[PDB]
């Protein structure tokens, strides 16, 4: 299984006596076991792309051939760990060496083999039964949150010949044995899957269930759905932290994966430092987010193969849990950083460049990336379902949208949560641009909204109409000063402000506003829009002659109603239950209608 | 037929990108298909794009990941990719490789046709002289569609070009006052887009006359440059051997161009613009020109090669080279979409190169050509007036300019705006044209002769 190094021209190593090798196989070059891949082959010689520095590699050094191509190791212990872009545990490398550096040629198994995991068989299987790919034959108890379900690896099937009894097993033992056509396969708790291969599913389903984030903006106006794909701009002043924390802390997904592609060292530290300190209430207990999270960390000075592969390593980990029936939410910190890594590799391979210097296949790679997300029907007899969402960020050089990476991304993702810096400078958070942002899942979610809430859809339609009109009136206001202006337009302007202030704006550093349940979000909007309609009618039905209602009359007459509307965001769901908050909102609705009634 | 046993080789010389190079091959044939098995049993196929002596270069469709050098087993079929075709392919769903994906059987061939096809003898090609009624005023009036014409929709990411194509599939008839077999090549698209069309075809109750070819974003990029040929090859069988009128729709042709560009880079071919092969035009003509009627046979093929314009750049090689080959374009844009106008079809940069013969006395109404030309003049001028007024202000305009702003405003909401299920006749479209033209006095309708104005304008 060994060959020899024939020569080194830099990061490219030529091997000889390596006839039995496949393209995009893996090799460990030299006595330090440098990680690389075989790209070009000719005769019994192979051209190896080495990820790490090749200094010191000699002619005649050994090359160890590894049968599996670039793959992700999947099994118990994946949760709570931080990995390199090519699946190297950074928390073990720094702890098994006492070093601060990643050793050159470091060879630490992705999942430690010194942990005795608590494994319980399904208790439904027997020796002699039939099992197929995707079937679950036992569960490992990792922590209080996520059960780590052990599936039969895809592309395997047969008759069960041995089932391990319940007990403590490590990742190097044998848990299940199966025989197919006389061939016996011994399986442990860990499966290996090529990172560039898409894990099969029974069927790909439409995404209909909302992604229940905790923000009023980026939900009511711009919905995301479980299994959907969105993009978020990543600029210093955009306030992207709000989405990252809100999505990772309170989301209705089961597993969070955060993927770095190749960011600044200090930025990777900020993510690695923040995440372990995040908590959420679960069963009344406060649990660390890292018990249901996995993170892949890549800085700009990591091997380019890892920075390019990081994005696919993340989604492979995501699909692994998708196949368990979990809802997984993956964030790519910067897909622009990935695209940069990809261009570098194309350059190293002396490929002809295309648009703005990027590889000709940039679009094909992004399209196949996002296509892997979605709600699916899982493999295996348990007839379980799950999904993967992608909320990858884009950060093109210069902030322009002409860069092929951002342009291609926007043509692929169905939701764009366009953020702005001006809003952050104004201290308005979340920093959502509103006019640029869009969601193309509004139709897909109409069935859910109609079934469970009914009035939500006309409310979000009116809300966008009010906000857009507020923008449309901007030129009239600038040239007029609200003097030569219709009273109906004054309602639009002042109510639109009310919406911007006491609905779309949310203060995540307050205990009452940490998370806004949907029923509260629609409650708040319903009363504001109901006010809008009542104010429009109060003016319009009396605007003929003699005795008319104006905004000055409405504002002065029922100022307590405008105050009560602004106060609605303070209804803390932790102390005031669903019935109490709805009851108080119902009282405002009645008081509001009566306030206008007193004017007619 | 080919009675001699095929040879199997384990003589792979080397692998370089998507190309597997074999040596020691007996009498290599150019553009023959090779079937290869990987050490793990995976089966893949490719085509010989070059032969030299005992060597041959095979481009593998599925890809070259996992291809070995010692255990790889290849066999040469001994012919070119000739594909099975039958009439009963309508109602079936295939992948981009020509295999069924609807849980039905493989194709029970009536014959085998060369995917490369043959050029139609221009002496027997018969000029199109029949109009298709699309029901869309923006098309039937100012850019008519002939039966056998090639009209892509130039669009941009996020615009409803899929809805327009779907609409055309249901309400496309004739103006002779008819069931088209539709072949839909879904390449480089996501599941939801392919499911959108498949569901619409069933909703329309026409699925028994629809043949689908799917090659999704997660499918190999090399198969994406045979899918159009598979669709058109089937269309040729139906149209020219079974005298069935066929409508062939190719989804974002830009995924074809990108798949082609990748192959061009891999083979180090001479680039033209934006990295695309210098022969991109010739390759596109091979796909596009498989259309039109043939004298003496009652079939036809009509194409709608919809394509996405990268960054809305109308001069990008993809729309540019297409514009040179096809008989014009419908072209949608964002300026109409951003105002909730559907269909968002912008007539100004559009044209139909067969319109001059498919309209008028004996075809639709004798004033058709005159109404279209004047509407183009009035629409373009209204746009010119906005370009001026944006700087000089409304007070700088005279009555001669305000008329074009009134026309432009009424034109877009009355003529272009319709809705996904608004099916207008060609005669209703012209009547609407006149309603807009009657905004102006006769003297300003300078593209229309008095021999037409005197009859139609008074009404």
């Amino acid at each position: 299984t060994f060959g020899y190094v024939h020569g080194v021209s830099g990061p490219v190593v030529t091997a000889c006596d390596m006839a039995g090798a496949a393209m995009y196989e893996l090799v460990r070059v030299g006595h330090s076991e440098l990680v690389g891949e075989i790209i070009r082959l000719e005769g019994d010689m192979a051209t190896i792309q080495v990820y790490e520095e090749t200094s010191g590699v000699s002619v005649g050094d050994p090359v160890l051939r590894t049968g599996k191509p670039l793959s992700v190791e999947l099994g118990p212990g994946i949760m709570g760990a931080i990995f390199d872009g090519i699946q190297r545990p950074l928390s073990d490398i720094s702890s098994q060496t006492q070093s601060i550096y990643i050793p050159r040629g470091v060879n630490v198994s992705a999942l430690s083999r010194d942990i005795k995991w608590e494994f319980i068989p399904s208790k439904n299987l027997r020796v002699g039964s039939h099992i197929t790919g995707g079937d679950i034959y036992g569960i490992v108890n990792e922590n209080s949150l996520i059960k780590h379900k052990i599936m039969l690896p895809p592309r395997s099937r047969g008759s069960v010949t041995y089932i391990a009894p319940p007990g403590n097993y490590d990742a190097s033992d044998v848990v299940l044995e199966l025989e197919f056509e006389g061939v016996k396969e011994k399986l442990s708790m860990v499966q290996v899957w090529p990172v560039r291969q898409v894990r099969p599913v029974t069927e790909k389903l439409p995404a209909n269930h909302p992604l229940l984030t905790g923000q009023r903006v980026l939900d009511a106006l711009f919905p995301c759905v479980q299994g959907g794909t969105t993009a978020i701009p990543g600029a210093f002043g955009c306030g992207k932290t709000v989405i990252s924390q809100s999505l990772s802390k309170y989301s209705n997904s089961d597993v969070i994966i955060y993927v770095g592609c190749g960011e600044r060292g200090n930025e990777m530290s900020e993510v690695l430092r923040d995440f372990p300190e995040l908590t959420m209430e679960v069963d009344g207990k406060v649990e660390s987010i890292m018990k249901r999270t996995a993170l892949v960390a890549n800085t700009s000075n990591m091997p380019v193969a890892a920075r390019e592969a990081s994005i696919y390593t993340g989604i492979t980990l995501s699909e692994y849990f998708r196949d368990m029936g979990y809802h997984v939410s993956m964030m790519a910190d910067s897909t622009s950083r990935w695209a940069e890594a990809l261009r570098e590799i194309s350059g190293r391979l002396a490929e002809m460049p295309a648009d703005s210097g990027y590889p000709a296949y940039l679009g094909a790679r992004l399209a196949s990336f996002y296509e892997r997300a979605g709600r699916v029907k899982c493999l295996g007899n348990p007839e379980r379902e799950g999904s993967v969402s992608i909320v990858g960020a884009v950060s093109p050089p210069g902030g322009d949208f002409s860069d092929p990476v951002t342009s291609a991304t926007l043509g692929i993702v169905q939701v764009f949560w366009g953020l702005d810096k001006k809003l952050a400078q104004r201290k308005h958070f979340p920093s959502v641009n509103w006019l640029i942002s869009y969601s193309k899942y509004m139709r897909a979610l109409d069935e859910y909204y109609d079934k469970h809430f009914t009035e939500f859809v006309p409310l979000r339609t009116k809300a966008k109409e009010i906000l857009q009109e507020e923008e449309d009136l901007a030129e009239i206001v600038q040239l007029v000063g609200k003097a030569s202006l219709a009273e109906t337009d004054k309602i639009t302007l002042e109510v639109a402000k009310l919406i911007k202030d006491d609905f779309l704006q949310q203060n995540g550093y307050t205990p009452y506003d940490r998370f806004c349940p949907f029923y509260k979000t629609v409650g708040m909007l319903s009363n504001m829009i109901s006010f809008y309609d009542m104010a429009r009618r109060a003016v319009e039905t009396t605007a003929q002659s003699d005795n008319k209602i104006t905004w000055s009359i409405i504002r002065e007459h029922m100022g307590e109603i405008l105050y009560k509307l602004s106060s609605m965001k303070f209804k803390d769901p932790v102390k005031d239950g669903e019935a109490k908050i709805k009851a108080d909102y119902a009282q405002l609705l009645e008081d509001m209608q009566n306030a206008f009634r007193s004017l007619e | 037929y080919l009675s001699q046993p095929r040879l199997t080789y384990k003589t792979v010389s080397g692998v370089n990108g998507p190309l597997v190079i074999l040596d020691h091959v007996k009498f290599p044939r150019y553009a023959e298909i090779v079937h290869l098995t990987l050490p793990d049993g995976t089966k893949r196929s490719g085509q010989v794009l070059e032969v030299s002596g005992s060597k041959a270069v095979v481009q593998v469709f599925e890809g070259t990941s996992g291809i070995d050098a010692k255990k790889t087993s290849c066999e040469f079929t001994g012919d070119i990719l000739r594909t099975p075709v039958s009439e009963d392919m309508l109602g079936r769903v295939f992948n981009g490789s020509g295999k069924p994906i609807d849980r039905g059987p493989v194709v029970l061939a009536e014959d085998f046709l060369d995917i490369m096809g043959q050029p139609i003898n221009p002496q027997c090609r018969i000029y199109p002289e029949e109009m298709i009624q699309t029901g869309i005023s923006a098309i039937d009036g100012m850019n008519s569609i002939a039966r056998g014409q090639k009209i892509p929709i130039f669009s941009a990411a996020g615009l409803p070009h899929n809805e327009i194509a779907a609409q055309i599939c249901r309400q496309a008839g004739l103006v002779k006052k008819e069931n088209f077999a539709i072949v839909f090549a879904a390449m480089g698209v996501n599941m939801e887009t392919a499911r959108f069309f498949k569901s619409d075809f069933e909703e329309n109750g026409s699925m028994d006359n629809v043949c689908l070819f799917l090659n999704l974003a997660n499918d190999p990029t090399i198969e994406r440059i045979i899918t159009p040929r598979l669709a058109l090859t089937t269309a040729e069988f139906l149209a020219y051997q079974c005298e069935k009128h066929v409508l062939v729709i190719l989804t974002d042709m830009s995924s074809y161009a990108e798949a082609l560009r990748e192959v061009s880079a891999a083979r180090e071919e001479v680039p033209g613009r934006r990295g695309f092969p210098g022969y991109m035009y010739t390759d596109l003509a091979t796909i596009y020109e498989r259309a039109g009627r043939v004298e003496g046979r009652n079939g036809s093929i009509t194409q709608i090669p919809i394509l996405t314009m990268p960054n809305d750049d109308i001069t990008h090689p993809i729309p540019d080279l297409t514009g040179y080959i096809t008989e014009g374009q419908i072209y949608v844009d964002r300026q109409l979409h951003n105002r909730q106008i559907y269909p968002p079809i912008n007539v100004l940069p559009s044209l139909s190169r067969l319109m001059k013969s498919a309209i008028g006395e004996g075809m639709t109404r004798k004033d058709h050509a005159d109404v279209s030309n004047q509407l183009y003049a009035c629409y373009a001028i209204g746009k010119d007036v906005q370009a001026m007024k944006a700087v000089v202000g409304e007070e700088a305009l005279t009555s001669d300019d305000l008329l074009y702003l009134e026309f432009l405003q009424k034109f877009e909401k009355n003529f272009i705006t319709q809705g996904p299920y608004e099916n207008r006749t060609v005669y209703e479209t012209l009547d609407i044209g006149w309603q807009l033209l009657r905004i102006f006095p006769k003297e300003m309708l300078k593209r229309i002769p008095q021999s037409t104005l005197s009859e139609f304008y008074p009404r």
Binding site: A350, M352, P353 | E268, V270, P271
Partner: peptide, 19 residues
């Protein structure tokens, strides 16, 4: 870039022939 790539490949081909 295209021309330089072909120049580098032609140089490699010339070198192999000389060996």
């Amino acid at each position: 870039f295209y021309r330089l790539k072909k120049i580098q490949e032609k140089k490699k081909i010339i070198k192999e022939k000389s060996e």
